[PDB]
Structures are given as structure tokens and as C-alpha cells.
Amino acid sequence: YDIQAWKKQCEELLNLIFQCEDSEPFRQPVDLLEYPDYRDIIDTPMDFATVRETLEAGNYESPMELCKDVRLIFSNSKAYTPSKRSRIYSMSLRLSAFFEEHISSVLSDYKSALRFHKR
Numbered sequence: 001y002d003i004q005a006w007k008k009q010c011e012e013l014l015n016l017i018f019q020c021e022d023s024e025p026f027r028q029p030v031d032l033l034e035y036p037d038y039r040d041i042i043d044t045p046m047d048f049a050t051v052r053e054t055l056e057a058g059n060y061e062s063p064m065e066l067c068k069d070v071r072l073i074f075s076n077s078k079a080y081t082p083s084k085r086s087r088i089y090s091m092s093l094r095l096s097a098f099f100e101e102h103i104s105s106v107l108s109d110y111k112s113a114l115r116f117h118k119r
């Protein structure tokens, strides 16, 4: 029932994501010189360094907010892909499965801890 435990859990999950080769295209903002039309399709760019910096700045109140930003990395990849068989998008799908597998207990434990706090 530790209301604050999600933060270190998210830091460790981000460390695992950075060690994963599938995160390479998503570790820093999409390079607008390499993809000049990126902002014509994507309204809100997001990447794992921005997520880690937001967390470290104390700018996430809950793991649900971090999860919304991580999911935005994957939805941006899906929206920008010219094909469902593209390399970067295919890496996003595996990384998304890995993230969802690991974030599930972080969200469950936090929501349970908050319910206990407000019992």
C-alpha cells in the first residue's frame, strides 16, 4: 500500500526499456531533419528521454500519467508508419508488448494503494 512506490518502479522499467535494442528509435525525439513532414502528421511528439526527464523532474503525479505518455510514443509510431511491416513500427509493437506486460502491476499496486489510503 505504498502510494509512492510507482516512481522507482517506473525508473527501473525505463532502465530496462533503454537496454532493449527495440527502444533505439524512441530514445530521443524524432529527428525532424530526417523526417521533415513529421509534425504534419504528429501533433504531440513523445520519446523515452522526455518521459524519464518528466519523471525525474517530479512532473508526473501518478503512473497513469507516465503510461499515457509512453502509449503516445507507440501511437505516434503507428500514425507515422507508411506500412504495418515497417522496421521502426515493428520495433514499437514488441516494445509496447514488453511495456504493457511490466506496467500492469505498477498501475494495479498504485490504484490499490490509493484505494487503501482513502478507505
Ligand SMILES: Cc1cc(C(=O)Nc2cnn(C)c2)no1
Binding pocket: 024, 025, 026, 027, 028, 029, 030, 031, 034, 035, 077, 080, 088
Ligand atoms: C535516438 C534516435 C532518435 C531517432 C529517430 O529519429 N527515430 C524515429 C522514430 N520514428 N521515426 C520515423 C524515426 N533515431 O535514433
